[PDB]
Amino acid sequence: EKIICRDVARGYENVPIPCVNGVDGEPCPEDYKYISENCETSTMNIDRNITHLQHCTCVDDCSSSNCLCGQLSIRCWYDKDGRLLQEFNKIEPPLIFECNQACSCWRNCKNRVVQSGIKVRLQLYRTAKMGWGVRALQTIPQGTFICEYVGELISDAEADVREDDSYLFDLDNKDGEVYCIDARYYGNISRFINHLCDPNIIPVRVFMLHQDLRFPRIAFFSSRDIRTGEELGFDYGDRFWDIKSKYFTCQCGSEKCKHSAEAIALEQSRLAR
């Protein structure tokens, strides 16, 4: 086992993200460009108009019920330490509207967690069965911001012709025109987070410096206390596995695994009779 890179983010995050390999001879991944914030190749025509921001008139730290930005998700879901409240809906999370440059409040108000970046210590590591993965190097309480799903913002039409969908994330569940983040060519640490059938982080859609609802940003928060050494993972979703399961099956090893060869076979044999 060897530390093969001290910081895959090259200093772009608040904290380093080392890479270790104790499984094989694979060097730290080079077949992508690490970026800390979303990029575009062809333009997405994002509405950046500062006058199109809903914003608040608070002169405190935006902890009162009078903060419009909080009201845009019924309430601000962050406590004084930046963690999601206990009663936050982790099954169907609301859209979060953080404070922004139009708000009268200060940059250090309580409604600005995701825009402040990575704070926890993570490690890129070689897994036994799933390629690279990401694990915690510290205790992470439930409700803590982990990292953003960062990559190249692309259209539905462009996503459809991309050869590799292994790093592709669509931004809404609906049937219409849905934009995507493709982390294949450009991405951050999130591109390495694997699927777990017993996940410990959840994606939350967030708005910060724009409120172009076509382009929510994807923030991962812990859904339970996470222990040092624990692999991070979220539920990729059934749609992902419907596509992929003819190529590989889930190796998460959970007793609750929904997408292993065994689980899939038990499903099909249920119908084979």
Ligand X SMILES: CCCC[C@H](NC(=O)c1[nH]c2c(c1C)C(=O)CC(C)(C)C2)C(=O)NCc1ccc(CN(C)C)cc1
Which residues are near ligand SFG by CB under 6 A? 130-133, 166-167, 191-192, 194-195, 248, 250-252
Whole-angstrom distance, CA of residue 255 vs CA of residue 273: 25
- Binding-site size for a copy of itself (CB under 8 A) equals 29
Q: How far is Cα 257 from Cα 221, in angstroms, rounded to an integer?
A: 21
Q: Say if CB 244 and CB 264 are below 8 A apart.
A: no
Q: Is 252 marked as a binding-site residue?
A: yes
Within positions 111 to 170, which residues make up the interface with ligand X, using CB under 6 A? 156, 159-160, 165, 167-170
CA angle 91, 221, 258 (to 5 degrees): 50
Backbone CA torsion sign across 2, 6, 10, 15 = positive
Spatial neighbors of 212 by CB under 8 A, at least 6 apart, are: 46, 47, 48, 52
Selection from a copy of itself, ligand SFG, ligand X, none that 237 binds (CB < 5 to 8 A by kind) is: ligand X
204 contact choice in a copy of itself, ligand SFG, Zn ion, none (CB below 5 to 8 Å, kind-dependent) = none
The bridge status of strand 2-5 relative to strand 19-21 is antiparallel
> DSSP letters along 20-57, please?
EESSSSPPSP-SSEE-SS-EESS-------GGG-----
Binding of residue 236 to ligand X (CB under 6 A): yes
Q: Is 176 annotated as belonging to a binding site?
A: no
Build a one-symbol-per-residue string for 178-197: x at contacts with Zn ion by CB under 5 A, - elsewhere: -------------------x
Q: Decide if residue 98 touches a copy of itself (CB under 8 A).
A: no
Residue with tokens 């991944």: 29
Taking the C-alpha atoms of residue 113 and residue 131, their distance in angstroms, rounded to an integer, is 30
Residue 135 vs 191, nearer CB to ligand SFG: 191
- What letter does residue 108 receive in the DSSP assignment? T
Binding to a copy of itself by CB under 8 A, coded x per residue (else -) over 56-75, reads --------------------
Instruction: Kindly state the tokens that stand for 255.
Output: 């007793």
Spell out, one character per residue from 173 to 192, where the chain touches a copy of itself: x when CB under 8 A holds, - when not: -------------x------
Q: Nearest distance from residue 241's CB to Zn ion, in Å? A: 9
User: From a copy of itself, ligand X, ligand SFG, none, which one binds at residue 192 (CB under 5 to 8 Å depending on kind)?
Assistant: ligand SFG
Is 56 assigned to a binding site? yes
As annotated, the binding site for S-adenosyl-L-methionine includes 130-132, 167, 194-195, 251
- Interacting residues toward Zn ion by CB under 5 A: 56, 58, 62, 67, 69, 99, 103, 105, 109, 111, 197, 250, 252, 257, 259
